[model samples]
Target: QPHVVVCSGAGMGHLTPFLNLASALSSAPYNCKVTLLIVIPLITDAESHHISSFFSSHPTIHRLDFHVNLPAPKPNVDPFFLRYKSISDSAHRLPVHLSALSPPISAVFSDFLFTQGLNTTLPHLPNYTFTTTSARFFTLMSYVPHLASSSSPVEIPGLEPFPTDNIPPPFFNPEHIFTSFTISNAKYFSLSKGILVNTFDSFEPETLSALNSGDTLSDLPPVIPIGPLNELEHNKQEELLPWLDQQPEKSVLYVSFGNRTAMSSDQILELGMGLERSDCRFIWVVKKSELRKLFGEELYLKLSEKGKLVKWVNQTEILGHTAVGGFLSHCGWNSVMEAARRGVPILAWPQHGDQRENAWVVEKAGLGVWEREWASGIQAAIVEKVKMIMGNNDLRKSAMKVGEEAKRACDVGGSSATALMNIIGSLK
Candidate 1:
């Protein structure tokens, strides 16, 4: 069997998708020996916990850590400039490590920032760029080079108008680090043989079509939509699992931001109060401090009826549970993908990078609802949105359809499976 190497920049969002892909590749008919080249911190962190836990469960797949030593932030230095250089330095060591791998490494799949570093050495090898974001975001990114100069929002193909709101704030400034980063990544994406996306056809049919037909950009690499590739194994010790089982079917709202996302106490209180007032059964993954605030303050005596709050829970498992009818979320990519596959509609509370865009895609795709001006009237909006997502039969039905499509896309003879097969065949 041939060996395939995969790597991603550090963080749970970037690294876990590659881990899931490696797990998938090492199994079944595409029984390639898979190894992960991880970009990790010198200090132990969530990245190490996630990666170690994943590999421990799947012992067959191999992994090598590329640890980067980062300096602490100071008053004047450019942290990004310092951080990226170390990352690139660590990345430069990949070929030396690659020469040591088994079966001579058949193909390489790396996410955005790390892919460009390999451009010099891996010219003769097949290296495809992989991303954890949706196809719509990818399409918009591919056009960043063309769109960076324009002042006005331009119409884009197979996507909603770039209505400045659709454009992330980082795109406005040409000299912005994010803007330059995107332009360079897209440039390298063009150089790669193909682009591997963590999405399926039916979810973003229009967006994928734009990339496929050259409507988005000419000479764009062939995009392989081979995903909805989420971690199926939840080896965490369960605390709320039994509690969720007793809740009525389609009656609970599952609220969570990404692991690292947290807000000021006031903002956290606002969310908790609204969740309390919604008159709904809910399970919220929140910080213990916030939980203490909510409980120690008012709402506890009246709000203890049917809500469960914990520091962590298996989000994928929670979303897939029959009791979870709606999600109150930051509209994260991985979170939305799990919700979509589980047929759970989202409230679409976007608050971070790629979050607003993910919310738009989910709402546009009929898997969730988005409120453009909800944040202005934050607390009140939550109750209304919560009730809406939980009770809207049409939304539930639409989510169910997409969920079925998601499963089909990953099945044998499905779109994603065939896409993977073709990509692997090309590698061979």
Candidate 2:
């Protein structure tokens, strides 16, 4: 069997989805072996540590590899410095990883950032590019032409004059939604051998149909929607399981952001007030900033008497809880699929790039509503939107119906599992 080198670059958002997909591939049959070539600067933090532990603990994860490298000897990165190294200033103390690895790396599964760097080094290696996002977002990105051609750009609800191909989405602030209409083209996409998405055919039948019907984004590889991958395995994040077990079905709201994001003390306090105002039972997992001061502690202490706030909680366990009614999230793909599979509605608080795009899938498209900023006052009108879905019988029923379709896409003869089988069958 040839080795499938699953290359995950910087950030937990990029790496975690690869871990989830690699895990899914491991559980099903595949002719090629998977070696997770993790590009790690440090494995000290909670998110990174959890991912490392998740792989190490998996039963079918027999063949795996880690390439631990420190670009500089230090354990942290400055965002400005990282951008400088990647763009204007090109010198990096990065280790020459590929040469030091085993020969003839076949079928590389790479995050978008390293596509160019990976292409430059391993020129002839076979590659599969995973666009760690929902189908609507990926379709929106790869084919912005479709959006403009489908409707008049000026009247599209959000903004006009969007950057056609090379533009990236704006920063995630509620008022700034219309500021930048830049669409993400995901460079190196057209150059890849195949495109694998962490979505289901059931969720975005329109997008998949467009791909098959020879639309603008049809140039990529066979679109395989092997997802809700988070639900396939029943391990990790078990602490939230007991918490959810005590709640009523469709009653508790689950709140979590990706492990890396943070906000102001004022923002945290605002969030605390609103959760209380909603008068709904909730569970929020927040990351304490070692550098920034916190305002929500005393308030959280008061709130915790009614709700639960863990620095980190087992996500999968919490979402699968019968009492979990909704998800308050930053729109990471893994979290999205987990919630979708469990039939929970989403409350999007998107941060950057694809997070904004994923938020569109949940919030703008009517799957759920937006709770713009947590640490600030959410609009009273929007609160009604949240309640309409959470408290109303029709919305809850609709969310579950979509969830059933999502689950069917991952089952024995489902699109995702079949895609995995095909990937394995192709290997020599």
Candidate 3:
């Protein structure tokens, strides 16, 4: 069976992203039959319809199965340390059983974290690991083991002035690497099996070229840039697209914080108030914060009266909409790619993960302003940063230009597209 079995950890961050990339591969003109095997937890809040519905309608798409009843932690219960143990335990157990069934798992693309034991059970399987956040986060991961070991000497190269190297290579130190190295260390890399990442060449030109052009890193699985993957699903077009046509071109600010991240009720209210105060036409996705004590029904209503509140919207469609002049994003890679694909201006309020680094990319290239004032650990500063980002017209123009470059790079026969094809072809 020519199948790509996709498995990600139960978290929304992992599942949501890998599923989108799986959807993109399914839609590509490749001859292989594709099946996205979402090994979901016994209970998960993963938004299934966003990807499931799209694959169901595609003729070439072979199967989309959510393997329920797998042992995974329930939402909002475990402490941070316990959660990690549960995840590691679950990862160590699942893959062997899944691999036992026939077809023997041809190509594997497990989410980066669970990639440990998940890759172990399928020792002979061709595997790819993906992260939905900035590719730079993986660059950061290259130094985590060292960071965890030291206190005062905790600085990552290029991030600050620590003496590791100019920049450490991806999975540079086998002992330091968290994910792929733990599983199938001997047979996998030695046997010419592959690894894959979900990113575009234009987004990280220097790193991509260095990895692909070099000897050792180049020998690993090809660094495929099959990204802007969020567009593979069309759940948002039912309402978002039509709304876009009605609004004035480039007048709306589309806001979303991805699916999982939450804010305190005060922060949420402050955001709503800030948007309303800006007097701009906007659409915001609300993830149902637990800190509702700080906000009231009246405040919510007033904000809703000014801006649209979508529990969840098709983000890719919303970004592509002509009326969306700017994005107020959490700087998730998916959101970043969507905005870039459509040439929309960005107002990035990145909170951890690759977002912090991706925010730097946006700022450095003059593509968008990285709202780091929010990171000063002050609630009032967040509100001020949001206000400042919303009010800056010059920032918007520069962001739009960068967005245009992203659009150009992904066009038919474009550099990004070609690089992706070349990488995918090299995968076994």
For each candidate, the alpha-carbon lDDT, in order, equals 0.76, 0.60, 0.57
Off by over 4 Å in 2: 59-105, 120-123, 139-187, 231-237, 288-298, 363-366, 371-376, 379-383
At residue 328, give the lDDT of candidate 3.
79
**Alpha-carbon deviation at 155 in model 1, angstroms:** 3.2
- Comparing 1 with 3 on TM-score, the higher-scoring candidate is 1
- TM for candidate 3 is 0.76
Q: Give the least accurate 10-residue stretch of model 1, judged by summed lDDT.
A: 76-85
Number of the top-ranking candidate, with lDDT as the measure: 1
lDDT of 1: 0.76
Residue-by-residue lDDT tens digits, candidate 2, 235-278:
45466677667777777877787776465555565666667667
Tell me how candidate 2 scores on lDDT.
Answer: 0.60
Clashing pairs in 3: 195-221
Predictions: Cα RMSD each: 2.5, 6.1, 5.4
Tens-digit lDDT track for model 3 on 251-293?
7778888776467655676776666566677888877443234
Candidate 3, residue 114: Cα displacement in angstroms equals 3.8
Itemize residue pairs with steric clashes in candidate 2. Answer: 237-314, 267-375, 271-375
Ranking by TM-score: 1, 2, 3
